[PDB]
Structure formats: structure tokens, C-alpha cells
């Protein structure tokens, strides 16, 4: 009797009060403690050394308590700890042990999920300092770390970096560094209000699998000039990806340094997301120095169905090499994305592009092995004032990239700056189904729509089709004499081109090559013999040794004669056709022709 | 001893029974009440004034109890109330205060989520009456309402409107009216069995953000002739959207009035959903009178990867103006959708269309500013009997819309009714990669496949390519004399067209314009001079002053002569070519030619 | 006093300890038991006949306990049973009653969800035996079974089939057989480590609705030679689908027998998933013997945005018939998928294909009714050594299929083995926007890129466009004399084709048909008359009665004359053109021409 009150008021008391589910005679006879033991919260470990519960807050470092929770539940084979709603839980110190090396705060462990319903906020302790809030490595050296398996973070809660700036550019900052991560995920969480390098990294140098980020929000995660670089999510293990996320920045600096996602390993995806205020949408890249876990090929890379306002490049391709590994990038699809360059002055941020073939980090452009890339069904728009805007900026070696059924409304279709890199290009394919918009019409004085500033182009197709007039452009497509061209097909549709002085320009007359197939409009002057009847007409210039046929794009205003409808050429480089003189006399005309070579 | 039994049986008793998580010496020493206080249900507030629990049911209005729950949890900084499974909770009265003005039942509040596992059902009180079940405004005037933040509704439960009809057309009915809503969502819920205006509205006139509807079901939400209009989900704040939802109607009235989604603000999306039995798939629209919260441009509008059986129009574009605001719609992508018009009699429901450029609500067609729209990679099908079916019904001013790589199998490709609106059209682009199906072949007597009933067309491309014969159609494309045409490209591929009397028709000979680029097949009669040898042939008609070249689409059955392969023209409007007379004599032939102008 | 201790220690004790939510004076006065009664776990039913809790494990069959849980909660109108984390719950026996007939273990019931957080593992009892772990039928005969409604399985847990092989090929094995299933779903679960037929089947012969599988993982679910066939998920009710799943196999046998998904009913989808190591991506099929629940048409079938490495066919189409039902398949879209055939020897697994039109299960190829299929915006790749690789293997009757804007890099574009089936083909459309890759260049000796081994082709379009040279191929497109051709358009673009001996081959001269529209390059020898001036040239061969026009694809090396630019024909089958002799004399030349017929 007397001792019973004692048990009950004691910590063992719920262990002495019996329960049976809904008075069901078949249900287990248990104690209240057992049913309470089926869930677990931060409250169960957020206490002083006497077991008295401590209230979280500005002046309480909840780090050790959350760590004890994770360590204990890890002890029992796993489960899910709730971080309670209606409370803000401040972290005010570094973790210890193997996460020491990673500037860790909290160590994640296998099979221990966190359901974050409340808010987690970083304390001023962390101002001007590196940090990585959650860390799945168990060792300061990642090569010697064990794995993190079956760890899920989710809920409706928030993680907040307290608005503190970086202290030096050299510092790193992360939200969730899963480590060598297998079956791990972040779902539903808001990450906000910081200056960090990443919010989440999945995998480490290819080690890991089936990691995902889904329905999270990323807001204002760069805020100072000191921050050297940002990629919100870093997918660095295969069979992993990001979907249905929302990414937003408002800092000027973000527009210069910040990317939403990097995909660095095979079978990874970025889908169904919305981006605003970033410099870059996605890096898709095989880095040789991150190839230890999952081979040296990144393949099956998908970027689909995203919405974006960016200030530089939507999708950046790349590959590179190290002393002993060579990186390859192949089998990539980019489709269904709708993307625009936001309002900004020309040249005020990295050069705007839907696709960029970037050089490596040291800036080498002759190490890349990028091929079998499919860009299809996307739309891109840049405002008319943005000189530095392009469907593709092709700044490094390219072994293939195929464009079909896109809509591009910007300054250049193909661009590379002259006298910079001289890319070697193979298997660039620009199908005629790509629609070229008109927003930059009349803006293109001194400029070439496809400006082919390359070392050489082979096995490529450029099928230019305009949709409106732009008589300001210097040419539709220009190849400088420095660029070799062979086994390629280059064509300009005559629509909207009749008043153009130059349609296709080959500055080293490269269209003469044995295996070059071209067609484009030009104005030609002809003069006939004086014979009544069937009568030949010849070009006055001799620039046409390469032409296999030509046909009229002009009406004939004359009654007493007609020039030929079609032409071929002669050894001396003249065009020749058979027209008709109703009445005799030497004729002289200027006609618009479609010139054709092997097509 | 004596008093102890008293405490324990009392409401404070669980506050006196100690608990420690799994007898762990490091875990907090708590009371049972504390752990029970970590969750909260309707059961905790569904009681009489004495604290005795009340059973929900047909004759119990659970409204006040749920409201007390929400108000209390709101009190503590938020959390999640469970609406328990295995029970139906009837609502039988209006809410009070600021939701009064919105016909509100339950008021939502910030950070208070509802996990709906059971069923919520409307009582007969609400028959023939307006209602809005859940309401995030705090004020009857929305302009003076505060915000709703971080409010999520989810679970496997059901909301049921009890099958009651509208009382008058003027009435409104909604399920979740989030109000000025920021980070709010509805996930997993079934909405069923009613006659309402919307099931869910996100945002209010552009105020709000990051609102979503995901994996919900909408079933039989229109059922009477009195219901004036329905849109199941109304996205009226940016960075918001609908995905992976299911929408179904079985009412005849739904096929005339009901739309699945309206997107009314920037950066919004509708994806991965299935629709059946509706009139309309989606409205995508900038309404000037809903532009107070997020500017006057709707841009970054995405409709992707949906499945639909509808009776009218899949995607409706629009923009309009008010005295002081002008609405603009730009940067829209519609792709990957597979859509069909369900079995119905011709003209039995609003005119079937994949895309409709609709006039404003007053029916004005000269106020719209719609451009940079990309329609790609969709398929559309209407059954052969449905005269009123079209890839695009272009009923109002259009400043651009680009079609690429679609498959359209219906009655018209481009349509507008004659002598209705006279749209001004710019930058309409119909790429040759659009495939035209054959289901309506032989159904097109007296009809034009592309029936261009416009005030004028500029900077547009129509590249017609058939895939099968339809000799019933009057023409492939017809421009009435009333329609101006300039700086456009119009072409008809000869495949399947050889037996066509008319391919392209220009009723005011608009193909003669300086900047009009065309090509299409026609039959022409020619007669030659009698000269042996090289000999000219001339058209007997003089309708060809506009032709720059023509070429044969016919074989030559003759041995003693051949007509020219290619033709040009003369000032008098004749065609002329140089053929060959092996033996002399005047020749006369009818040939099928490809006529070409500046192409 | 004395009796009170008794109550409290007893199973009714929590029913005597009072609780009030957060000491709120307005909250219900309840007992602890009531709040505990709001959740329910396996622990509440995993006891001996005395109510003592039993620990799960290798030597404990948890089947009867889980079944009692489900039966009881079913009793109360539904709810969610947690299968606890940190524990493995072994199943060691068959269920009884109506699931007896289906080799059932656990019977599912309506409104009873399972939240699987721990692991469920099959005991050795099941080695070499059939089994179906979860079963929604209530009757051994499915035609007499009731329905399963509102049943959801989800969590972060695992289902594991213990690695046991099939005992005989005739046996069936499943994970979740939902039965006649309406609003049922599987979310988040890993299925692993077995030898089964399916992991999940939704619906039964068209009965059921709104069933989905989302974010699940399927790993190593085939492991022996005895397993006759595998499809991981079997969607057999409408308005149902699979998304964002991960499928992986490592068994050799899987590459020969295993498919990731079959869609067998209308309005079903397969999206956003990743596949590795399987033979097949998806079957999309109307089976007449599975048409009792939802009609005989499968329509609105979507396969979108998936990533795959497979060894046979990505998407298999089919339809078939029974004595009294005829199956139809129409309105299908396949887009945005990126797919490759994994490294393997040629012919080492079923013939690699992006699309396969397969014959029925008995192998009949004349029963199918497949039409309105849209394949767009996909990429496909097979390694260069894989002879047996194709964009489409067209092995049975086809009533339509449309390809647009794809990238195909494999051995064949269109293929069927000769002297096997002789498919009747209608409305096959291969748009010019399809890009043909170069990986198999130089591998195609004795082979035809489009090898049209059909009974007949009508209303079809093949627009061949190469992107690089392959002079190893016998032809770009070949029609054997056995194949009829009519009302079709067949064309070969001259780019990369100038050195080809054969471009298009018609072995029964089928290009002569009245309604056949073609164009392709050929080399032709001509000789002229000796006349000075305008002078005709004629082909030495008489194979050209069908040509309507031709034009030069060669330059003219000569000065004293030029051959005609364009040609027509004569009754005797010669080509004839008018060229020019500056100086007289008989000329003789070999030119590359574009031959054209009615285009
Ligand atoms: Na060079
Ligand atoms: Na007009
Ligand atoms: Na035949």
C-alpha cells in the first residue's frame, strides 16, 4: 500500500499501470510504459543530470541531448526521433569524435530517422565559423568512414542557419552531409536563412545509393561576398536524385556564385523543381577525383520538367581527368524545362546560357569526353538587352550533343568567344525542329546567330530556320577560317532571309570540302548570251566551283525573256543555267538563289 | 494514501505517474501526461461542458469542438491535430467571426496542421446553402485579412459534401480556401460527393507562396444545373501547384461547366495528374483583377504529363485588363500530355480543343497579351464524328504560340469561326514535326484543315504535312480575303495531296506579298512552241506572277518529248520552262507542280 | 484502497488514471487508456493465450498475431497498425480461409492500413513453395471475391523473401496482391531478396481503381533458372500507376525473364522511375482474358521520364483476343525516357529494342489492334557490338505508331526478322526529327538500317536523315519484293550518303506505285547529243519510268559544257534534261542525283 504510491510516482510507475488495447480480451496485457516506449522524442533526452526536463531556447545548447537520443535509439536497432513542433531547438556547440574533422554538430546514425516538426536554429557560437549540421561520417577521414544506411529526415519543420556570414572563403558549411550514404532521404523540410556551401550532400565520391531529396525548400542560403561557391544539393552517389523541390535566393551574390543542384554520378536526376534567383540551375559532371565509389562514367543523367529564373547557365556539362583516372559523361537527357534569364544588365553576371560546355576547374578545355546528350522540348528566354545569352555556350571539347524540338529566344544559338578556347567539336546536331525566337531581333549588329568559334567541326548538323526577320545580324552562321569543317551538314532556310546580305559565311571557304553538305540563299548577278530562244545565263563572279545546284528565289519581272529556274556550275567557278529569250538580246539580272552543295 | 487515489482518478492523475523511456538511466524523468501531451486529437476537445466525451454522428455538430482544438494548438505555437480514423465527424453549422463573410465553417490557423484520417461530412443544414469548409482568412474582407502560414492538411481521410445541390447559381462553395497562404498544402485527401465551385483555392489575388496539392482525389463535385461554374483547384499565388492528383466527374453538367485546375499566377504548375469527365483540363490565365499580390504577369506556367478525357478544351489561355492594370501571359510550356475528347455528339458540349485562346469573361478578344508559349510532345485525339474538335481554337488576339513535335488527330488543326471574332495573330509557329492524324479523314466536306479566320497573320509559320489522304477536305489551308498576311511562311508538303483540287487557298491572293514565303502543289496546263529541240513551255493561265520557281510532280508518259523539269515565270503571270522536243510539234500537257515563292 | 492497487496493476488500470490535455480546462476529461487506444501496433496482438507479449524472431511465426490485429481493427471501421521499427517479424505459415486458394499468408482488409517500419521476413517454411504475402481477396475464386477499399501500406520498412528459390516453374509468388482493389497504395517500402513472379499486383482483371505504387524499392527479386517469368508491378485496374520507384536486379536470369512493370488497363502510368539489370522496362498491353472489369480497350497509357539499363525491350506493345472478347490498345504516349541496353554479347539475351510490337503469348501476330501511339523525346543507346538492337522491332500487325523527336543510337531503326512473321503495317510514322546516332557505324555489313520485312505497308512515312557516315550498311532502307507498299512517303536525305551504292532499295520496284511518294540519292550515267548550245542529256539506263524529277548532287568539273541541273523522264524509262554545250560534241557523265517521285 505504502510502497505502491512510491513506485507509481517514481520513474518506474507507468511500468506498473496495466493497459489492454480497447479492453480487447485477445490483446496483449501490457503496461503503460510499453506503449509509451513505442515512440520517442527529444523530450525523452533533453534533461539535466538529475533527469529534470530542460526548456529549449536562445540560451540552451540542445546539441548533446539530441546526440544522446540518436546514440540510444541507434542502440536498439533504429527508429524515429521526433523533434517537437511548437519549439525552436538551438544548437550551440560542435560535436566530437569522428565528425570533429567535418566541423560536425550532430552525428547521424544508421536506421535512426529524425522527424523534424519544430525548428532547429544555429546559435551565435557559429557566426563566422564553418559548420556541418548533420553528418553521416563516423570518421574525420572519409576514406576510412563506415556507411550511413536507412536514415531519413522529414517532417514539416525548419532548419535555419541564423543568417551568419562566412568568416573566410576557405570555410565550408553544410546542412545535411549524409556521407557514404545508402537509402537515406530528406523530405518536406525547409532550409533557410544562411551563408553556406551546400544544404545537402548525398554520397561521397560515388559511395552510396538510393539517396533522395523531395519536397524541401531552400531559401536565402547565400548572403555575403565571402562565400566562394554554392550548390544547394550535391548528388554524389548513384541511383539518387532531387524532385519537386523549391529553391530561392534574393542575394546579389547568389546570382554570381549559386547553383541549385550538382549531379556527379550515374543514374541521377533532377526533376519537377522550381528555381529563382540563382546563377545556375544544374552542374552535370564526371569529376575524376570523385570517381572512387561508382566508376569514372557518369551516365543516365536526367534534368527534366523544371522551372527556372537564373542569371547564368541552366545546365553545365563537364568532365575531366586526374593523373590516374579519366572522367567521361554520356547518356544525358535535358527536357521539358522552362527557363529564363532574369532581368539584368548585359554582362553583369556569368554569361547566360541554356546549355554550357564548361572547361574543367583549372580552366582546361581539351580534357573533356562528353557525348550522347539529348536536349529536347525545353524553352528558354532571355530579355532583349542581354547580349550574353545563348542556347549553348560551347567552350570546351565536345564529342556530341543533340538538340531537337526546343524553343530558344535569346541572343546567340551557338556561341563561343573568339580567341579564347578552341574547342574540338564532333556530333553537334541542331535539328530543323528547333524554333528560334524573335525577342533579340534588331539587336544583333556585328553579330552572328551561330558563331562557330571552334578549332574544328566534324559530323555535325546545323539546320537554321528563322521564324521572323532580323536584318541586324551580320550572318545566320559564320565559320572563321581557323575552324576546320568536314563531314557535316549546314543549311539555312530562305524564310525571312531574302533581304540578308550574308546568310552563311565560310571565311576559309570550308563549304568546298568533299564531304560538306550545305545550302543557303545568296544574291547572284547573271548575264546571258544574245541568242533568241533557249539561251544560257552565266554568273559574272566565279565564286561557285563548289555548287552542285541552285534555284531561283526571285520572280521574273520581264516579259521578253526569263532566266533559268535552276543552275549548275562550270570548272571556272561560274554558275550556268538554260533560260529563254522570246526575243534575242543580251540579258543581265540580279537574282536571289538558293545555292546547294550535295543536297 | 487516501488523497492519492483521488489525484489519480482525477484529470491530473497521469500527471502523477512517472515514466522514463525504456528504463534508460539517461532519459528524462517525466510523467505520463507529458508524453500524452506530445500528440493531440479531436477527442481531446470533443466534449460537453463537463468534460465528458461526446460521440460524433449524424445528430452531432462537431464544428465547435474542432474549432476549439485549432484555437488551442494555435495558442502553443502550432502542431498537428488528428481527426481520428474509424469515425465520421459531421459539421452542422457556420463558423463565426472573420470567416462569417466567406460562409466559413472551420477557421484554419497558422502552424496548425490537420491530419485527417477519418471522414468529415456536411450535415443537411448546409443543403441549398453556400459554404466554405475550411478558411484561412481571419477577416471577412480579404484585403484586410492576415496571412495563413505553415498549414498542412493531409492523411488518408475523406471530405464529403453530402451530395447537396446549390440553392442558387450566385452561391459559392469551397472545400479548402487557404486565403493569403504561405507554405500550406493538401496531401492524400479525397474530396467527394458534392456540388461546389472549387474544392481547394490556394492564395488570394497573388498573395501567398509555396502552396501545393498532391495525391488528392476529386470525385463527383458537380451535380446540378444550378451550379454556374467549377474549377476543382484554383492556384492563385505563385510558386505553387498541383501534382499527381486524380480528378473525376460523372455528371452531364460537369462536361459543360467543369475545369480541373486554373493557374492564375507566376511559377505555377499542373503535373502528372489524371482527369476524366470534365469539360476542361486547365485555365492558364493572367486576370488583371487578381494581380494585387504578385504583379500583372503570369509567367513560368507549366502543364505537363497529364492524362485526360474531357469534353471541351484541355488548356485555355487568356489575359485581360482593368481600368488601371493590364494583364500579360508569357513563358508557358505544355508538354507530354495525352488527352482525348470523350464520346459525345458533335456540338453537344463546348467546342473541343487541345489549346483555346479564349476571349476575356465579358467576351472581348482585343485585350489579350499572350506570347512565348511552347506546346510540344503532346498527343490529342477526338472521335471522327466530332466536327467541333481542334488542335487550337484561336478566338482572340495572339502574340505568339509555338507548336513542335505534337500528334493531333482531330477535325481541324487551326480553327476560328468565321464572322465571329477577328483575332490579330503574331508569331504562330506550326513546325513541320507536328503529325496530323487520320481519324477524321473523309469527314471534312466543305471544311479547311487550317481555317485561318483572322484579322491578320504576321511572322507566322504553318508547315502542313499530311500522313494520309483526305480528299474530302476543301483545302489544307485557307485564308479568306479578309485576313491580311505578311512576313510569314506557309507550306504544304505534296505527300498524300496529288488528287487534291485545292491545297493552299489565298482568297485575296495574299501569297503575292513581298515578304510571304510559300510552297504548295497545283495542277497546271501548259502548251509549247513547235520547235524541234530545246523548246519552251508556257502555262495557259496567267495566275502565277508571284511564283519564283516550280518543279514537276508528274511523270512524263511521252517518248517524243518531255516538258521542263522546272519553271520560272514572266511579267504577264505565265509560267515558263525549257523542255525538249525530240520531234517537233506543239505540245500540250497537264502537270502537277510544286509552286514555290521565295523558298 | 486495497482494491484500487488491484485495478491499477490490472489490464484495466490505465482505464482508471485520468488525463486532460495539457491541463487545459476545456479539454475532455479522459483516461490514459483512451489516448493509448488512439494508436495500435503489432505489440498489442503479439501475445500468448495468457496475454503475455511474445518476442518476434527466427523461431517465431508472427502470422496469426498480425492477422488478429488486422481482423480486430477492421472490426472498428479501420485504422493503421504499426509494424514496429528495430524488429524483424518472421512469417512462418499459410493463412487460412479465402486466401487459402491464393497461397496467402496475411489477409488484408478494407480501411486497415499497415505502417511497416520494421522488417518482415519469410521463414524457411516457405523455401521451394508458392506464396503471396499479403492478399486482398476474401475468396479463393477471384470472381466471387469482395473488394478491398482504402488499404494503404507504407513506411520506411522492408519486406524480404528470404532468398529462397522457386520449387517449380509452375508456382506463383507475390508480395502484395491487392485483389479487387479500390483506393489502395504501397509507399516507401523496400521489397528485397527473393525469387518471385511479382512484388505487387494492383487490381484483378480490370476490377479496381486508384491504386498506386510510389517510392518503393525492388531489389534482387529473381534468382533462379526455375522462375518462369517476372513483372515487378502488375497494374491491372484503371486510374492506377507507378511513380518514382527504383528497380534493380543482379541475376543473369533477370536479364532474360524480368520486366519492371506491366500496364494492363486504361488510364495507367509508369513514371519517374529508375531500372537496372532487367530484361524489360514495361509491357503495355490489352489482354482479352483480363477485360472483365474495365472494358476491352486499354487507352491512356503513359510511360514517361524513366531511366533504364535493360537487356531486351524497353516497352512492349500488344493486344490479343479470346473466343468472345477482342482486345484493343490505343492512345499511348512514351516520352522523356532515357534507356540503354547494358553491356552484353550480341544475341545473348532477348533482342534489344526501344519499342517492340510483340505477338500474343501463343505467338500469333495477326490478332493485334494497336494504334494512336506517340513515341517522342526519348533517347536510346546500345553498345556497338550489339547486332540485335533496334529503335522498333515490328513483329506483329500494327495499326499505327508515331515517332517524333527521338534520338536512337543502335543497330537498326526499323527491324523485323525475315521469314518469320509478316506483319500488316498501317500508319507507321517516322518523322525527320528523329536523330540517328553513329555508334554502330561501320558495323552494318550486309544489313539494312530500316529493314522493312513486312507483309505490306500503307499510310506510312519514313523520313531517313543520317547524322554521320556509315558506308558499311547495305542500304538505308530496303523493301523486299514480298512487301506491298502503297499510299506512303519514303525519303532519304542526301547528307552523309554521297558514297553509298544503295540508299533506298525497292526489290519489287514498289516505289512506282500511283500513290507512293519518295526521294533518294542515286548515281546515274548520262550521254548527250552533240549539238552546240542547248542540248539534251539522257540516262543510259531505262530504270526511271517512275521519276517525276531529279536534280544534281554533283559539281561539274568541265568548262566546255554543263549537264542539266534538273531532269524529268520519258516513256521508255530514261531520264532527260536540257544542259549546255559551249562547244559541240557528245558528252558522257556520271552524276549523283536526287531522284524524286511526286515530291
Ligand atoms: Na583549327
Ligand atoms: Na483584316
Ligand atoms: Na505481301
Question: Could you explain how this protein is built, in words?
Answer:
Chains A, B, C: This is Tail spike protein. Chains A, B, C: GO terms for molecular function: endo-1,3-alpha-L-rhamnosidase activity; metal ion binding. Chains A, B, C: Belongs to the P22likevirus tail fiber protein family. Chains A, B, C: It is found in: Virion. The structure is a homotrimer of 599-residue chains. Chain A folds into three domains: 1-80, Hk620 tailspike protein, N-terminal domain-like (Arc Repressor Mutant, subunit A, Helix non-globular), CATH 6.10.20; 81-513, Single-stranded right-handed beta-helix, Pectin lyase-like (Pectate Lyase C-like); 514-599, Elongation Factor Tu (Ef-tu), domain 3 (Beta Barrel). Chain A is built from four helices and 52 strands. In chain A, the strands form six sheets. A twelve-stranded parallel sheet of chain A has the order 4-7-10-13-16-19-22-25-28-31-34-38. In chain A, a hairpin with a 4-residue loop joins β46 (516-528) and β47 (533-539). Chain A is mostly beta strands and 599 residues long. The first copy, chain A, starts with a helix and ends with a strand. The relative contact order of chain A is 0.05. In chain A, 5% of the residues lie in helices and 42% in strands. Chain A is elongated, with a radius of gyration of 33 Å. Chains in contact: A-B, A-C, B-C. Chains A and B meet through α1, α2 and β51 of A and β1, α2, β24, β27 and β30 of B. The complex binds sodium ion (3 copies). One sodium ion is lined by residues 455-456, 482-484 of chain A.
